[PDB]
Every structure is written in structure tokens, then in C-alpha cells.
Amino acid sequence: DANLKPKNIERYELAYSNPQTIEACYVPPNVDELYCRFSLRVEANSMRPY
Amino acid sequence: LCTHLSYSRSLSPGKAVFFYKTAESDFVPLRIEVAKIPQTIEACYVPPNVDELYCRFSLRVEANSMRPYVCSNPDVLRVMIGLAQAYQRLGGYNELARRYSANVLRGIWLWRNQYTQGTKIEIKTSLGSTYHIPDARRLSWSGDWPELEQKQLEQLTSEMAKALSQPDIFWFADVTASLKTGFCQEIFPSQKFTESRQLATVECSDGQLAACINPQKIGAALQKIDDWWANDADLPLRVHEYGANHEALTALRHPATGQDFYHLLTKAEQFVTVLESSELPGEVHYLMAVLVKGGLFQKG
Amino acid sequence: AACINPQKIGAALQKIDDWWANDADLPLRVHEYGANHEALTALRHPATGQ
Amino acid sequence: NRYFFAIRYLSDDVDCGLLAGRCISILHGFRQAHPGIQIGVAFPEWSDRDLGRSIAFVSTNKSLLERFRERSYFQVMQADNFFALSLVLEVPDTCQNVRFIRNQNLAKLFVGERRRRLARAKRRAKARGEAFQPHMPDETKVVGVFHSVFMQSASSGQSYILHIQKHRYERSEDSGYSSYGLASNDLYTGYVPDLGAIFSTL
RNA sequence: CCAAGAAAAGGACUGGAAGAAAUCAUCCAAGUUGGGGACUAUUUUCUGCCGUAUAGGCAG
């Protein structure tokens, strides 16, 4: 509590876990390489105010 | 202190998968059988005629504790930078590397599956080294290791000491162990957490399932190297800001003692001063270990 | 399938600005006020005239 | 043509699986003293979620059932206010029957059973002289609902579990009960009335 | 021992006829959610037999 009083919590009460639900992503076994792709367009559009 | 302060993790595994070899193909997964009885029962054991089981995982190590991921205070930042370097140049990374390295070679990341007729561990790295522990069943936390084994601990310690302390080195290790097994020995993979029980598996690229151990379950085993409290080494704790001990349901560095991370975090100005006069005390070893297992250190 | 968002790719490509304080350091994402997220601050605060 | 009596557990913290096992053990011991008898076990408080806090016994010979009721264990448990006992009375003629068959096939769901089965199969092949070449089944099975009762071995160093299922009755043949008063899937036919009725008596 | 005390509003009905809201009309410009993690615990399912047999039935 505001780095002042440490809270009343009994010793055993912090040995408990905190469960959570998460999403995650891993490369599956035996894949040799991963690919990533995207496209890019460029326009000469700074010459004049929209 | 300050409002925003974060570190990211400097050491991490991917997951572990169990498999065996045949004369026809090199990777055949160990599978799990389920009966719907929903409310199910299930089992997993090495099948007849397979003499040994393999377990494999990968590890990356990164020199990422030298600098705060985020810091909102220029004075907090100046100090944390000075401290990491004040420590690095006196050594001490060797000590941390020695402790981490010892755990990989010992094999405790196998948890409940250590009880074999003989376990062999082999390690390869991205710098071209190979290490070989012919039998992992005899190496203690405390004690002198037998010859030729003590030596590989030193060599591995050196590669990792660098991986932890100098940037732009891309260091990977590939750890495979072999379990020589019993007639139809039961295997203990990670369990599923639910709101009867279920076991965890992964999918193969061909659609088969396999038994596995979760990433953080491998990780929890590796980082268990905290024995700096109460001048009584016993066995080490998993590094935790409060010194939690799950087996006894207690906490060794309870805030009431002044021995936790947060009290210690505020004395950095004093530690740097000492390091300059330098011997490294338990208080700075603890702090460095926590910075390596980075997380949120905020709302000061 | 897993992806990376358009503007997340974009923020990386346009990370080009080391023209402040006559000391290049690392470049910032172009921003009218010179925002710096990592340090939670701003390098071209209106108070500077920059 | 049928008589019964019932026992209920008074304590709210009673463990049904542990305690039920003792009543069966007594029945067995009695069966050993007088081999030519037939007494069936029923669970009038059976549920899909639990086993229930009560047990009943059913038979055809009034005078014999009285002798069973007089067994010292039951008398002690009543005296200390653990058990509520009923008297022996006639079974109502307006009810339906159930089997209470036990299923040993469920043993095969556990690793210990598979290990034993294969060890014997390997050894058994030596007589044939062929190489040991076992062949495993597929990954999915479907089973019905069952409850467990905790059991001690007879004059040995072991303990194990009984797995009980409840089947509805269909009438044929002639009867017999197993040593535990339970029914078997085959060649052990018997039944008990499902006396979930008139349970307000305890 | 209440501005005291007592009180039957009842009967009967038939609001119907007609009808045309239409014409047009432009929402546009840029924009980074993000850093950490043990579901296994003081738990019950162990030992034999029939059988070509991880089929299918039985004794503890």
C-alpha cells in the first residue's frame, strides 16, 4: 500500500498461482523455412494539395 | 522510482517434443489414447519394442538485460545503465552462466521423467561446438563433477557468458536427450489446465499428434538458481520477486523482512558506489537475476 | 492465418528522422511534434519553435 | 417373496466410496460361512452424479436375512450413532428391476492393466515358438457411466477398485449372484428391485 | 359514547356514402496496443487365470 504499509497478506496466500487465458503461435515441427510476403505501391502525390 | 519501467526476457526455450525412431522413418511421434467414457480417461506409455525415447528442444540466449525496454525517467535510466556495466566488467556473468549451464547438463528439465536406466544428453551450438554428457544421472547441485565433465561445464559456461553480455552475437543451442527406458514405461507430459484431466499435445505438419512439455515448464526448471537467502543454501528457488516456495506454501523474501526485490531496487545508487570501490555480494546477484527474467517494475 | 497489420509495416518503413538537435542518434517515426514512444516524450515540443 | 432392510449414513462428511466397501466385505465373509445362500446388493439412492449415502440388501429367505442383520459390525455402528438401521420387511409388489452389473473391461483403460496383459502375452508365445509380435487397437473408445467402490484384498497385501454400472432389467432364464452380490455381464444373472420408493422410512 | 341512528337509479337504441403526394438531389482526407508467467498436488485403479489374441469372458 503506497510503499508504506506492506499489506496484511499471510505468508501462504502468495504461493498460489494466477491463472490466465492467452493466444500464442509456434512454428510446427520439421518445417525448414518460413515465408513472409507483402506488396507496396508508391504514388507521386505530394506535388499538389488534395 | 518512476511510473514506467520494463525489461524483456533475455533467455528462452521453445517447446519439447517426445518421439522415437524406426527403421522406416526418423521421426515417429509418441501418441496419447483417449476414451470418452467429456469426462474421459487417457493414457500414454512407450509402446512395445521401442528401446529408447528421444526428447528435443531449442534455446536462444540474448544479451538483453543491458538496457531498459521502456523507462520514463532520465535519472533512473542513467543509474541502471551504469550498474549493469559496473557489474559486467568485474565478472559475475560467469557466475550466472555457470548456474544456468549446470542445470542444462544435469537434465532437471525432464521433471518427473528422470527415472531411466541411463540418460544421455547432447548439445550443439551455432558457433560449432558439441557437448556430450554420457550419463546425466549423477550430477549434483553441490559437489565436484567427475573429470572431463567438469571441463565441458567450463566450456559451455564461456559461450553462454558471452551470449548474455555482448550484443550482435546470434547464439542458438539445440538440446536432445535420450532416455533408455523400461518394458512399457509410463510417460509424463504437461497437463491441460481446465475449469477429469486432459494431457497436452502438438500437431505435426502431417496431421499426427505428439506429447510435449510446455515452453514455460522447461523454462521454470532452468532458472531455478536462487539460493542466496538466510545463509543456508539447501536447494535453490525459482527466481521470484518475493521468494515464493510452492512446496511449503510460504515466501522466503517476504516484504516484511526487507529482503525482496522492491526494497533492493531503490538502493542502486549505493551498489554502484560499492562496485566502484571494489567480493560481489548476494544483494547484487539477486538483482541481476531478476533483471534477466524481465517484467513490469512500475507504479513507483 | 497470422499477419502483420498494414500500418505496422508502414510505421517501420517511414522511421526516418534524425534531423533534430544536431546529433543523429537513432531516427524517429515522422511526427508533427517529434514524439518518442520508447522514452515517453517529445523532441519537437511547440515550446521549442521546432 | 422377497425381504430387505436398509442402512443410512448419519454423518455429513461420510465418504461413501470408502465406507460402502466395508459392508460388501462383511457380506463376503458371511457368504464364506454359508456357501449355499443368495443375497443381493442394491443402491436405492443411486444417482448419475454420485453413489448416494445409503445401501440396502435384498433376498428371499426371511430367517437368514435376520441372521445377517445380527452381525456385530452393524450393531456397533448403530450403537455409536453412525448408522440408522431399518427392520426386515417384505418387498413391495409394485416396482421395477435393475441389474447392477459390474464391468471389469474398464480395467483396460489404465496403463497398469495393459502392461500385465502384454507381459503375459509375450511369455505365452514361447510355447508357440513364434516371435512376439503384438498388434495394437485404435485410439478411440466409448464407455458408459460408472462409480467406484474402494476394496481391500482377501488375505493379501493388495487393494483395488470395483467399477459399478447400472443396467435396466430384462427377464429371462434363471438366477445367481456373484460373491459380492453383484451381477456379471454373462453367466451370472440376477436382479434387484429398484427400491428408491418408500425411502422415507429412514 | 365516530355532523349520531335506517335507504335498489332502473328500463329501450343501426353514423353512413366518395378519393392519385410527386419531381430532383457526390461524405471526404491521415492516422505503431504492449511488456512477464510451473495445474499437480498425500494421490486410491495393484496381483493372477481361460484364450491363436492389446478380441472377449473370470478369481482376489
Side-chain angles (χ1 to χ4, degrees), chain C residues 7-37:
Chain C
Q7 65 277 32
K8 190 72 168 184
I9 296 298
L13 293 178
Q14 295 185 5
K15 186 171 184 175
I16 299 164
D17 183 351
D18 55 1
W19 292 299
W20 54 279
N22 201 29
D23 185 355
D25 200 69
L26 299 178
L28 302 177
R29 195 265 191 276
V30 174
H31 192 281
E32 290 82 33
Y33 297 123
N36 175 325
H37 288 294

PDB file of all heavy atoms in Angstrom, chain C residues 7-37:
ATOM      1  N   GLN C   7      -0.584  -0.687 -41.136  1.00  0.00           N
ATOM      2  CA  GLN C   7       0.123   0.451 -40.573  1.00  0.00           C
ATOM      3  C   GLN C   7       1.323   0.042 -39.725  1.00  0.00           C
ATOM      4  O   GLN C   7       2.152   0.879 -39.435  1.00  0.00           O
ATOM      5  CB  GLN C   7      -0.839   1.296 -39.735  1.00  0.00           C
ATOM      6  CG  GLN C   7      -1.377   0.587 -38.502  1.00  0.00           C
ATOM      7  CD  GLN C   7      -2.565  -0.303 -38.819  1.00  0.00           C
ATOM      8  OE1 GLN C   7      -2.661  -0.864 -39.918  1.00  0.00           O
ATOM      9  NE2 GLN C   7      -3.474  -0.440 -37.863  1.00  0.00           N
ATOM     10  N   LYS C   8       1.373  -1.199 -39.240  1.00  0.00           N
ATOM     11  CA  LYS C   8       2.556  -1.689 -38.534  1.00  0.00           C
ATOM     12  C   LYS C   8       3.744  -1.882 -39.432  1.00  0.00           C
ATOM     13  O   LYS C   8       4.860  -1.698 -39.004  1.00  0.00           O
ATOM     14  CB  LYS C   8       2.242  -3.006 -37.825  1.00  0.00           C
ATOM     15  CG  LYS C   8       3.333  -3.485 -36.876  1.00  0.00           C
ATOM     16  CD  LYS C   8       3.396  -2.620 -35.625  1.00  0.00           C
ATOM     17  CE  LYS C   8       4.273  -3.252 -34.557  1.00  0.00           C
ATOM     18  NZ  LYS C   8       4.263  -2.470 -33.290  1.00  0.00           N
ATOM     19  N   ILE C   9       3.514  -2.313 -40.671  1.00  0.00           N
ATOM     20  CA  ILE C   9       4.572  -2.375 -41.679  1.00  0.00           C
ATOM     21  C   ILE C   9       4.975  -0.963 -42.042  1.00  0.00           C
ATOM     22  O   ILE C   9       6.137  -0.664 -42.137  1.00  0.00           O
ATOM     23  CB  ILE C   9       4.121  -3.132 -42.940  1.00  0.00           C
ATOM     24  CG1 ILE C   9       3.815  -4.594 -42.605  1.00  0.00           C
ATOM     25  CG2 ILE C   9       5.183  -3.044 -44.025  1.00  0.00           C
ATOM     26  CD1 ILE C   9       5.009  -5.365 -42.092  1.00  0.00           C
ATOM     27  N   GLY C  10       3.985  -0.108 -42.230  1.00  0.00           N
ATOM     28  CA  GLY C  10       4.208   1.277 -42.564  1.00  0.00           C
ATOM     29  C   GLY C  10       5.008   2.044 -41.547  1.00  0.00           C
ATOM     30  O   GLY C  10       5.912   2.756 -41.906  1.00  0.00           O
ATOM     31  N   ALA C  11       4.689   1.909 -40.274  1.00  0.00           N
ATOM     32  CA  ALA C  11       5.442   2.621 -39.261  1.00  0.00           C
ATOM     33  C   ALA C  11       6.918   2.303 -39.341  1.00  0.00           C
ATOM     34  O   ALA C  11       7.737   3.162 -39.099  1.00  0.00           O
ATOM     35  CB  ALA C  11       4.917   2.318 -37.875  1.00  0.00           C
ATOM     36  N   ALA C  12       7.263   1.065 -39.652  1.00  0.00           N
ATOM     37  CA  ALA C  12       8.659   0.697 -39.809  1.00  0.00           C
ATOM     38  C   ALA C  12       9.322   1.329 -41.021  1.00  0.00           C
ATOM     39  O   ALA C  12      10.448   1.775 -40.942  1.00  0.00           O
ATOM     40  CB  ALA C  12       8.800  -0.805 -39.864  1.00  0.00           C
ATOM     41  N   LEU C  13       8.656   1.329 -42.166  1.00  0.00           N
ATOM     42  CA  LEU C  13       9.259   1.881 -43.379  1.00  0.00           C
ATOM     43  C   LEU C  13       9.538   3.359 -43.322  1.00  0.00           C
ATOM     44  O   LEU C  13      10.496   3.819 -43.899  1.00  0.00           O
ATOM     45  CB  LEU C  13       8.342   1.603 -44.578  1.00  0.00           C
ATOM     46  CG  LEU C  13       8.186   0.129 -44.970  1.00  0.00           C
ATOM     47  CD1 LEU C  13       7.217   0.012 -46.138  1.00  0.00           C
ATOM     48  CD2 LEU C  13       9.547  -0.447 -45.329  1.00  0.00           C
ATOM     49  N   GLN C  14       8.696   4.105 -42.629  1.00  0.00           N
ATOM     50  CA  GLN C  14       8.834   5.549 -42.533  1.00  0.00           C
ATOM     51  C   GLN C  14       9.583   6.017 -41.317  1.00  0.00           C
ATOM     52  O   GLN C  14       9.496   7.168 -40.967  1.00  0.00           O
ATOM     53  CB  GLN C  14       7.454   6.209 -42.550  1.00  0.00           C
ATOM     54  CG  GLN C  14       6.698   6.037 -43.859  1.00  0.00           C
ATOM     55  CD  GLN C  14       5.390   6.805 -43.877  1.00  0.00           C
ATOM     56  OE1 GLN C  14       5.075   7.543 -42.941  1.00  0.00           O
ATOM     57  NE2 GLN C  14       4.620   6.632 -44.944  1.00  0.00           N
ATOM     58  N   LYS C  15      10.259   5.129 -40.627  1.00  0.00           N
ATOM     59  CA  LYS C  15      11.058   5.522 -39.486  1.00  0.00           C
ATOM     60  C   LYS C  15      12.314   6.289 -39.828  1.00  0.00           C
ATOM     61  O   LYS C  15      13.401   5.786 -39.643  1.00  0.00           O
ATOM     62  CB  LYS C  15      11.431   4.283 -38.673  1.00  0.00           C
ATOM     63  CG  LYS C  15      12.146   4.581 -37.362  1.00  0.00           C
ATOM     64  CD  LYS C  15      12.279   3.331 -36.507  1.00  0.00           C
ATOM     65  CE  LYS C  15      12.897   3.647 -35.153  1.00  0.00           C
ATOM     66  NZ  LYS C  15      12.929   2.456 -34.262  1.00  0.00           N
ATOM     67  N   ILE C  16      12.165   7.485 -40.375  1.00  0.00           N
ATOM     68  CA  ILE C  16      13.280   8.211 -40.932  1.00  0.00           C
ATOM     69  C   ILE C  16      13.223   9.619 -40.408  1.00  0.00           C
ATOM     70  O   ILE C  16      12.534  10.423 -40.997  1.00  0.00           O
ATOM     71  CB  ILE C  16      13.253   8.213 -42.471  1.00  0.00           C
ATOM     72  CG1 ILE C  16      13.333   6.781 -43.009  1.00  0.00           C
ATOM     73  CG2 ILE C  16      14.393   9.056 -43.022  1.00  0.00           C
ATOM     74  CD1 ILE C  16      12.930   6.651 -44.461  1.00  0.00           C
ATOM     75  N   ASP C  17      13.988   9.944 -39.373  1.00  0.00           N
ATOM     76  CA  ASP C  17      14.114  11.320 -38.909  1.00  0.00           C
ATOM     77  C   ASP C  17      15.204  11.433 -37.896  1.00  0.00           C
ATOM     78  O   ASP C  17      15.009  11.206 -36.726  1.00  0.00           O
ATOM     79  CB  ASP C  17      12.803  11.821 -38.299  1.00  0.00           C
ATOM     80  CG  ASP C  17      12.870  13.277 -37.861  1.00  0.00           C
ATOM     81  OD1 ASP C  17      13.943  13.833 -37.879  1.00  0.00           O
ATOM     82  OD2 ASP C  17      11.850  13.820 -37.512  1.00  0.00           O
ATOM     83  N   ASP C  18      16.377  11.782 -38.358  1.00  0.00           N
ATOM     84  CA  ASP C  18      17.468  12.129 -37.458  1.00  0.00           C
ATOM     85  C   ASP C  18      17.961  13.562 -37.671  1.00  0.00           C
ATOM     86  O   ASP C  18      19.143  13.822 -37.608  1.00  0.00           O
ATOM     87  CB  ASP C  18      18.633  11.156 -37.644  1.00  0.00           C
ATOM     88  CG  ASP C  18      19.117  11.074 -39.085  1.00  0.00           C
ATOM     89  OD1 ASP C  18      18.574  11.768 -39.913  1.00  0.00           O
ATOM     90  OD2 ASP C  18      20.021  10.319 -39.346  1.00  0.00           O
ATOM     91  N   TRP C  19      17.054  14.480 -37.955  1.00  0.00           N
ATOM     92  CA  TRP C  19      17.426  15.867 -38.179  1.00  0.00           C
ATOM     93  C   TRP C  19      17.353  16.810 -36.991  1.00  0.00           C
ATOM     94  O   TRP C  19      17.675  17.982 -37.114  1.00  0.00           O
ATOM     95  CB  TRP C  19      16.583  16.439 -39.315  1.00  0.00           C
ATOM     96  CG  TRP C  19      16.893  15.856 -40.639  1.00  0.00           C
ATOM     97  CD1 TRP C  19      18.079  15.899 -41.287  1.00  0.00           C
ATOM     98  CD2 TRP C  19      15.997  15.146 -41.487  1.00  0.00           C
ATOM     99  NE1 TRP C  19      17.984  15.259 -42.487  1.00  0.00           N
ATOM    100  CE2 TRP C  19      16.710  14.788 -42.634  1.00  0.00           C
ATOM    101  CE3 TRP C  19      14.657  14.777 -41.388  1.00  0.00           C
ATOM    102  CZ2 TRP C  19      16.133  14.086 -43.671  1.00  0.00           C
ATOM    103  CZ3 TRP C  19      14.092  14.079 -42.412  1.00  0.00           C
ATOM    104  CH2 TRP C  19      14.823  13.741 -43.542  1.00  0.00           C
ATOM    105  N   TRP C  20      16.929  16.313 -35.844  1.00  0.00           N
ATOM    106  CA  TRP C  20      16.848  17.130 -34.635  1.00  0.00           C
ATOM    107  C   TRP C  20      18.102  17.165 -33.755  1.00  0.00           C
ATOM    108  O   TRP C  20      18.959  16.289 -33.821  1.00  0.00           O
ATOM    109  CB  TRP C  20      15.674  16.640 -33.784  1.00  0.00           C
ATOM    110  CG  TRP C  20      15.726  15.173 -33.481  1.00  0.00           C
ATOM    111  CD1 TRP C  20      15.343  14.156 -34.301  1.00  0.00           C
ATOM    112  CD2 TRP C  20      16.195  14.548 -32.261  1.00  0.00           C
ATOM    113  NE1 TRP C  20      15.536  12.948 -33.681  1.00  0.00           N
ATOM    114  CE2 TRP C  20      16.058  13.168 -32.431  1.00  0.00           C
ATOM    115  CE3 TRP C  20      16.712  15.042 -31.057  1.00  0.00           C
ATOM    116  CZ2 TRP C  20      16.418  12.268 -31.441  1.00  0.00           C
ATOM    117  CZ3 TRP C  20      17.073  14.140 -30.063  1.00  0.00           C
ATOM    118  CH2 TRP C  20      16.930  12.788 -30.252  1.00  0.00           C
ATOM    119  N   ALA C  21      18.236  18.262 -33.020  1.00  0.00           N
ATOM    120  CA  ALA C  21      19.301  18.511 -32.040  1.00  0.00           C
ATOM    121  C   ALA C  21      20.747  18.449 -32.530  1.00  0.00           C
ATOM    122  O   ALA C  21      21.673  18.423 -31.717  1.00  0.00           O
ATOM    123  CB  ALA C  21      19.119  17.665 -30.786  1.00  0.00           C
ATOM    124  N   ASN C  22      20.924  18.426 -33.851  1.00  0.00           N
ATOM    125  CA  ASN C  22      22.245  18.378 -34.496  1.00  0.00           C
ATOM    126  C   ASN C  22      23.088  17.216 -34.002  1.00  0.00           C
ATOM    127  O   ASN C  22      24.312  17.309 -33.904  1.00  0.00           O
ATOM    128  CB  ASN C  22      22.985  19.686 -34.285  1.00  0.00           C
ATOM    129  CG  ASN C  22      24.070  19.905 -35.303  1.00  0.00           C
ATOM    130  OD1 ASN C  22      23.983  19.420 -36.436  1.00  0.00           O
ATOM    131  ND2 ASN C  22      25.092  20.630 -34.921  1.00  0.00           N
ATOM    132  N   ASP C  23      22.409  16.120 -33.680  1.00  0.00           N
ATOM    133  CA  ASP C  23      23.053  14.905 -33.211  1.00  0.00           C
ATOM    134  C   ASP C  23      22.180  13.727 -33.614  1.00  0.00           C
ATOM    135  O   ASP C  23      21.144  13.486 -33.001  1.00  0.00           O
ATOM    136  CB  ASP C  23      23.256  14.927 -31.693  1.00  0.00           C
ATOM    137  CG  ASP C  23      24.038  13.728 -31.182  1.00  0.00           C
ATOM    138  OD1 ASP C  23      24.327  12.853 -31.965  1.00  0.00           O
ATOM    139  OD2 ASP C  23      24.340  13.694 -30.013  1.00  0.00           O
ATOM    140  N   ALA C  24      22.592  12.999 -34.645  1.00  0.00           N
ATOM    141  CA  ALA C  24      21.725  11.991 -35.241  1.00  0.00           C
ATOM    142  C   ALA C  24      21.140  10.860 -34.374  1.00  0.00           C
ATOM    143  O   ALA C  24      19.997  10.480 -34.597  1.00  0.00           O
ATOM    144  CB  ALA C  24      22.402  11.402 -36.474  1.00  0.00           C
ATOM    145  N   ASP C  25      21.887  10.334 -33.401  1.00  0.00           N
ATOM    146  CA  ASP C  25      21.374   9.237 -32.562  1.00  0.00           C
ATOM    147  C   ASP C  25      20.662   8.140 -33.383  1.00  0.00           C
ATOM    148  O   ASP C  25      21.179   7.670 -34.393  1.00  0.00           O
ATOM    149  CB  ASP C  25      20.413   9.792 -31.507  1.00  0.00           C
ATOM    150  CG  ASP C  25      20.224   8.849 -30.324  1.00  0.00           C
ATOM    151  OD1 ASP C  25      21.155   8.680 -29.573  1.00  0.00           O
ATOM    152  OD2 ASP C  25      19.153   8.311 -30.185  1.00  0.00           O
ATOM    153  N   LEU C  26      19.476   7.741 -32.925  1.00  0.00           N
ATOM    154  CA  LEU C  26      18.561   6.887 -33.684  1.00  0.00           C
ATOM    155  C   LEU C  26      17.442   7.766 -34.225  1.00  0.00           C
ATOM    156  O   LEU C  26      17.069   8.738 -33.584  1.00  0.00           O
ATOM    157  CB  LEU C  26      17.988   5.770 -32.804  1.00  0.00           C
ATOM    158  CG  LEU C  26      19.015   4.796 -32.213  1.00  0.00           C
ATOM    159  CD1 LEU C  26      18.302   3.781 -31.329  1.00  0.00           C
ATOM    160  CD2 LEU C  26      19.768   4.106 -33.340  1.00  0.00           C
ATOM    161  N   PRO C  27      16.902   7.426 -35.406  1.00  0.00           N
ATOM    162  CA  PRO C  27      15.773   8.074 -36.083  1.00  0.00           C
ATOM    163  C   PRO C  27      14.392   7.876 -35.456  1.00  0.00           C
ATOM    164  O   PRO C  27      14.124   6.837 -34.884  1.00  0.00           O
ATOM    165  CB  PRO C  27      15.830   7.428 -37.470  1.00  0.00           C
ATOM    166  CG  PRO C  27      16.400   6.074 -37.218  1.00  0.00           C
ATOM    167  CD  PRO C  27      17.451   6.300 -36.164  1.00  0.00           C
ATOM    168  N   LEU C  28      13.523   8.872 -35.577  1.00  0.00           N
ATOM    169  CA  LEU C  28      12.185   8.809 -35.022  1.00  0.00           C
ATOM    170  C   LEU C  28      11.181   8.573 -36.137  1.00  0.00           C
ATOM    171  O   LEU C  28      11.485   8.803 -37.289  1.00  0.00           O
ATOM    172  CB  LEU C  28      11.848  10.105 -34.274  1.00  0.00           C
ATOM    173  CG  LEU C  28      12.798  10.478 -33.128  1.00  0.00           C
ATOM    174  CD1 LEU C  28      12.385  11.821 -32.542  1.00  0.00           C
ATOM    175  CD2 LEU C  28      12.766   9.386 -32.068  1.00  0.00           C
ATOM    176  N   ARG C  29       9.987   8.103 -35.803  1.00  0.00           N
ATOM    177  CA  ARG C  29       8.918   7.985 -36.778  1.00  0.00           C
ATOM    178  C   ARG C  29       8.476   9.402 -37.044  1.00  0.00           C
ATOM    179  O   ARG C  29       8.292  10.148 -36.105  1.00  0.00           O
ATOM    180  CB  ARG C  29       7.762   7.187 -36.208  1.00  0.00           C
ATOM    181  CG  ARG C  29       6.779   6.701 -37.242  1.00  0.00           C
ATOM    182  CD  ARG C  29       5.604   7.647 -37.374  1.00  0.00           C
ATOM    183  NE  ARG C  29       4.535   7.059 -38.164  1.00  0.00           N
ATOM    184  CZ  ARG C  29       4.485   7.088 -39.485  1.00  0.00           C
ATOM    185  NH1 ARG C  29       5.439   7.684 -40.166  1.00  0.00           N
ATOM    186  NH2 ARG C  29       3.477   6.520 -40.123  1.00  0.00           N
ATOM    187  N   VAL C  30       8.283   9.781 -38.298  1.00  0.00           N
ATOM    188  CA  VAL C  30       7.927  11.157 -38.593  1.00  0.00           C
ATOM    189  C   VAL C  30       6.639  11.528 -37.894  1.00  0.00           C
ATOM    190  O   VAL C  30       5.652  10.834 -38.014  1.00  0.00           O
ATOM    191  CB  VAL C  30       7.764  11.364 -40.111  1.00  0.00           C
ATOM    192  CG1 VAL C  30       7.244  12.762 -40.407  1.00  0.00           C
ATOM    193  CG2 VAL C  30       9.094  11.124 -40.811  1.00  0.00           C
ATOM    194  N   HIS C  31       6.650  12.655 -37.193  1.00  0.00           N
ATOM    195  CA  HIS C  31       5.549  13.072 -36.341  1.00  0.00           C
ATOM    196  C   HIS C  31       5.589  14.583 -36.256  1.00  0.00           C
ATOM    197  O   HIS C  31       6.656  15.164 -36.202  1.00  0.00           O
ATOM    198  CB  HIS C  31       5.647  12.453 -34.942  1.00  0.00           C
ATOM    199  CG  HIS C  31       4.405  12.619 -34.123  1.00  0.00           C
ATOM    200  ND1 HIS C  31       4.089  13.798 -33.480  1.00  0.00           N
ATOM    201  CD2 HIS C  31       3.398  11.757 -33.843  1.00  0.00           C
ATOM    202  CE1 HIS C  31       2.942  13.653 -32.839  1.00  0.00           C
ATOM    203  NE2 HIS C  31       2.504  12.425 -33.043  1.00  0.00           N
ATOM    204  N   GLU C  32       4.441  15.242 -36.245  1.00  0.00           N
ATOM    205  CA  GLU C  32       4.448  16.698 -36.311  1.00  0.00           C
ATOM    206  C   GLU C  32       5.071  17.309 -35.068  1.00  0.00           C
ATOM    207  O   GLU C  32       5.570  18.405 -35.115  1.00  0.00           O
ATOM    208  CB  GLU C  32       3.024  17.229 -36.489  1.00  0.00           C
ATOM    209  CG  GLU C  32       2.410  16.935 -37.849  1.00  0.00           C
ATOM    210  CD  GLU C  32       1.824  15.555 -37.941  1.00  0.00           C
ATOM    211  OE1 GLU C  32       1.341  15.067 -36.946  1.00  0.00           O
ATOM    212  OE2 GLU C  32       1.857  14.987 -39.006  1.00  0.00           O
ATOM    213  N   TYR C  33       5.032  16.588 -33.958  1.00  0.00           N
ATOM    214  CA  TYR C  33       5.596  17.046 -32.692  1.00  0.00           C
ATOM    215  C   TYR C  33       6.829  16.281 -32.232  1.00  0.00           C
ATOM    216  O   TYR C  33       7.238  16.412 -31.106  1.00  0.00           O
ATOM    217  CB  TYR C  33       4.528  17.050 -31.608  1.00  0.00           C
ATOM    218  CG  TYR C  33       3.409  18.010 -31.902  1.00  0.00           C
ATOM    219  CD1 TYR C  33       2.101  17.582 -31.980  1.00  0.00           C
ATOM    220  CD2 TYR C  33       3.665  19.339 -32.118  1.00  0.00           C
ATOM    221  CE1 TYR C  33       1.082  18.462 -32.261  1.00  0.00           C
ATOM    222  CE2 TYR C  33       2.653  20.223 -32.395  1.00  0.00           C
ATOM    223  CZ  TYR C  33       1.370  19.774 -32.463  1.00  0.00           C
ATOM    224  OH  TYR C  33       0.377  20.660 -32.746  1.00  0.00           O
ATOM    225  N   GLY C  34       7.377  15.435 -33.080  1.00  0.00           N
ATOM    226  CA  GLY C  34       8.569  14.690 -32.732  1.00  0.00           C
ATOM    227  C   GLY C  34       8.446  13.677 -31.619  1.00  0.00           C
ATOM    228  O   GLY C  34       9.374  13.495 -30.858  1.00  0.00           O
ATOM    229  N   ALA C  35       7.322  12.991 -31.534  1.00  0.00           N
ATOM    230  CA  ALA C  35       7.079  12.043 -30.464  1.00  0.00           C
ATOM    231  C   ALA C  35       8.097  10.918 -30.424  1.00  0.00           C
ATOM    232  O   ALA C  35       8.496  10.423 -31.463  1.00  0.00           O
ATOM    233  CB  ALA C  35       5.687  11.469 -30.604  1.00  0.00           C
ATOM    234  N   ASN C  36       8.476  10.511 -29.220  1.00  0.00           N
ATOM    235  CA  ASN C  36       9.404   9.417 -28.986  1.00  0.00           C
ATOM    236  C   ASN C  36       8.745   8.477 -28.007  1.00  0.00           C
ATOM    237  O   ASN C  36       8.716   8.746 -26.829  1.00  0.00           O
ATOM    238  CB  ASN C  36      10.742   9.912 -28.470  1.00  0.00           C
ATOM    239  CG  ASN C  36      11.673   8.787 -28.107  1.00  0.00           C
ATOM    240  OD1 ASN C  36      11.238   7.739 -27.616  1.00  0.00           O
ATOM    241  ND2 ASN C  36      12.945   8.985 -28.339  1.00  0.00           N
ATOM    242  N   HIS C  37       8.196   7.378 -28.492  1.00  0.00           N
ATOM    243  CA  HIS C  37       7.494   6.424 -27.630  1.00  0.00           C
ATOM    244  C   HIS C  37       8.315   5.664 -26.610  1.00  0.00           C
ATOM    245  O   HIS C  37       7.869   5.441 -25.503  1.00  0.00           O
ATOM    246  CB  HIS C  37       6.769   5.396 -28.505  1.00  0.00           C
ATOM    247  CG  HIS C  37       5.566   5.948 -29.206  1.00  0.00           C
ATOM    248  ND1 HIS C  37       4.438   6.366 -28.532  1.00  0.00           N
ATOM    249  CD2 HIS C  37       5.315   6.149 -30.521  1.00  0.00           C
ATOM    250  CE1 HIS C  37       3.545   6.800 -29.403  1.00  0.00           C
ATOM    251  NE2 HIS C  37       4.050   6.680 -30.617  1.00  0.00           N
TER     252      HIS C  37
END
